[PDB]
């Protein structure tokens, strides 16, 4: 091996390692910045600025073990560490070199939460946490509990009581709310939140709009939403059901307000609570749908972008180690009061991918479009649908459906590496390079990606 400088670097090596305190690694800014966490100490290296890596020991507040999962906001600016009981959100000290100051050391412990904070009674455990994609300065996190309750905490505001959507029902049997959620996932418009429930074998529901305290919205996207909103309005007639008409109007209003209160400088906008509370839309219609899958259940769901114009492809796991690629063919309308709204909740099964192995968890690295990493059993395969999704992408803006004639919709399924423990991943662009950091427990592999 040319062993020039890969895998070997200041920030990546550290002995005196305990066979416990797991380690994590995250990229940021197109594989520029790096965040490494080991022995309860955070390391960050900016492969543009910084000449050497700087660190921070947070062992004083958190003692990482194996109940924790850590995730970093896309912007990279933040980190969230949680378990089925508590949440810790820390602000990576970019630009900071010395972080020794025992007082400034705490000016990074931005948010804390523990289920044992609710009065008394049965307190259900945390099932997953997410950073809200468009939550201006990553100020909002979404916590899903066992009671399928989805809660949004405004990390940077004590004066902000959390919002709790899809609350429990005093009824019995099936009602309105979405029961038995197995996985959460945001749309690439960052306004819709997809949910994968099990109750009926597995269907898809969604929260449109799922908003944060303050929305992160650039001008390109402000318009896009705004336009789609008008096209919707323009399309209303007489056949349009009342409830739908109602929403669409309410939608154009809300969005027409986003436009007024838009902050041109920063690129944010304040979203008043009303609009924030919303009832679940769903179930979506998957079509066509393989008769087999009715026996099995859904495992996970992920969203893979295929360009930049938010044109995405939904992805669902299944028991038979099957994967399906759906395409949202109809423009949704926002909803709020409506119990069991379904107006235009439709998906189209593009392709199916059988793997037969056990599908542990789906993962995607933003930076590389049309690519999905499926953590099989002891494998990690990279399903690449850029074969046809790049064509599907043109046919969309060209309003040309001919190129899709006799085109074969097969994902070039490759194989990354082998692992036992469900790995961690990251995209590093080292010297114009596609690097895939694979962090198993002890392991810490590095590879390349086709393109």
């Amino acid at each position: 091996s040319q062993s020039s400088r890969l895998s070997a670097l200041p920030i990546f090596q550290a002995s005196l390692s305990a066979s416990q305190s797991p380690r994590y690694i995250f990229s940021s800014q197109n594989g520029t910045r790096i965040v490494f966490i080991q022995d309860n100490i955070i390391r960050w290296y900016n492969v543009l600025t910084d000449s050497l890596y700087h660190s921070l020991n947070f062992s004083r507040h958190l003692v990482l073990d194996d109940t924790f999962h850590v995730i970093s906001s896309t912007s990279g600016d933040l980190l969230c560490l949680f378990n089925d009981n508590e949440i810790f959100v820390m602000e990576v000290p970019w630009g900071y070199s010395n972080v020794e100051d025992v007082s400034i050391q705490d000016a990074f412990q931005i948010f804390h939460y523990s289920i044992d904070e609710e009065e008394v009674g049965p307190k259900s455990s945390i099932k997953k946490v997410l950073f809200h994609p468009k939550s201006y300065r990553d100020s909002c996190i979404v916590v899903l509990k066992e009671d399928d309750t989805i809660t949004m905490f405004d990390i940077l505001n004590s004066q902000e009581k959390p919002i709790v959507l899809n609350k429990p029902n005093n009824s019995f049997g099936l009602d309105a709310r979405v029961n038995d959620i197995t996985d959460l996932e945001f749309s690439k418009d960052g306004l819709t939140l997809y949910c994968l429930n099990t109750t009926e074998g597995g269907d898809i529901f969604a929260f449109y709009p799922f908003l944060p305290s303050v929305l992160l919205l650039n001008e390109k996207d402000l318009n896009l939403i705004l336009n789609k909103s008008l096209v919707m309005y323009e399309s209303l007639d007489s056949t349009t059901d009342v409830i739908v008409k109602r929403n669409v109007i309410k939608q154009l209003q809300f969005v027409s307000k986003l436009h007024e209160n838009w902050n041109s400088r920063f690129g944010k906008v304040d979203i008043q609570k009303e609009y924030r509370l919303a009832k679940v839309q769903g179930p979506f219609t998957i079509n066509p749908f393989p008769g087999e899958l009715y026996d099995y259940t859904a495992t996970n769901i992920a969203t893979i972008l295929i360009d930049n114009g938010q044109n995405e492809i939904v992805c669902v796991s299944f028991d038979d180690g099957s994967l399906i690629l759906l395409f949202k063919d109809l423009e949704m309308s926002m909803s709020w009061d409506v119990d069991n709204y379904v107006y235009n909740n439709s998906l189209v099964l593009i392709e199916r991918v059988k793997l037969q192995r056990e599908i542990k968890s789906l993962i995607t690295l933003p930076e590389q479009l049309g690519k999905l990493y499926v953590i099989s059993d002891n494998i990690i395969q990279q399903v690449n649908f850029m074969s046809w999704a790049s064509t599907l992408s043109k046919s969309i803006n060209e309003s040309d459906l001919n190129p899709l004639a006799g085109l074969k919709f097969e994902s070039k399924l490759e194989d990354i590496a082998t692992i036992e423990r469900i790995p961690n991943l990251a995209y590093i662009n080292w010297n114009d390079q596609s690097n895939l950091a694979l962090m198993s427990n002890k392991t810490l592999t590095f590879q390349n990606i086709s393109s």
């Binding site: 318009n223 096209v231 395409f327």
Partner: peptide, 28 residues
């Protein structure tokens, strides 16, 4: 008056729906 972008958006939207029919028949 006249529309410029918004029109394009509708085309796009419509097209996605057009694509919808593609896959609905392309299978069975």
């Amino acid at each position: 008056m006249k529309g410029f972008k918004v029109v394009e958006v509708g085309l796009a939207m419509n097209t996605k729906k057009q694509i919808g029919d593609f896959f609905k028949n392309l299978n069975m």
